[PDB]
Amino acid sequence: RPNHTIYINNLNEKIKKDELKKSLHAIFSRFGQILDILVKRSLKMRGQAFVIFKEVSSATNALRSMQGFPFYDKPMRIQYAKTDSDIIAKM
RNA sequence: GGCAUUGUGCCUCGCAUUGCACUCCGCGGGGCGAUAAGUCCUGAAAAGGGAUGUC
Ligand SMILES: Nc1ncnc2c1ncn2[C@@H]1O[C@H](CN(CCO)CC[C@H]([NH3+])C(=O)[O-])[C@@H](O)[C@H]1O
Ligand SMILES: [Mg+2]
Numbered sequence: 001r002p003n004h005t006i007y008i009n010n011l012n013e014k015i016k017k018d019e020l021k022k023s024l025h026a027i028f029s030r031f032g033q034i035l036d037i038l039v040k041r042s043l044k045m046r047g048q049a050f051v052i053f054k055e056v057s058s059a060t061n062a063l064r065s066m067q068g069f070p071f072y073d074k075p076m077r078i079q080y081a082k083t084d085s086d087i088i089a090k091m
Numbered sequence: 092g093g094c095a096u097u098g099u100g101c102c103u104c105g106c107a108u109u110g111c112a113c114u115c116c117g118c119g120g121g122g123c124g125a126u127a128a129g130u131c132c133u134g135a136a137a138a139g140g141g142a143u144g145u146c
Contacts, residue, residue: 005111005112007111007112009110009111010109011109013108016101016127017101017102017127017128018101018127018128036113038115040112040115041101042110042112042116042117043108043110043116043117043118044110044112044115044116044117045111045112045115046108046109046110047108047109047110048109048110048111048112049112050112050113077109079111081111081112082111082112083112085112085113086112086113087113
């Protein structure tokens, strides 16, 4: 808060992992270089995603711009990740 | 290829689920080594790939 990583939820759980990942990437890539998307369809982690930006400017612009955007017929809910993703905590 | 066991992850249907991960598996049916994926394995890596037993 802020953070390199944004946590998206209220996502449409019927989307296949591999295309949700590439969809998040194609859309959020417009707000800066991206290092990873982490997506699981587990019961704990379905409906959600972590997209990890290289620079925090990117993240906060993505969080402000894309808040509530209609994505696969649901409005995205975007917060800052509560904590640093492991790949940005190694640097 | 068949069979047993099994690591690993994918798809789909019903019910359920708004859930802060990188220490990762909802329940119940159905379909999977596949040029997906993988948290499992091989390699010193970049890359690659189920495994052990048994006809
Ligand atoms: N990565 C793969 N790619 C293609 N197929 C796979 C793959 N992993 C597994 N299977 C399939 O699962 C079957 C074996 N079951 C047990 C029954 O024997 C394991 C189920 C699962 N591990 C579980 O614990 O719920 C194999 O024959 C494959 O068809
Ligand atoms: Mg099932």
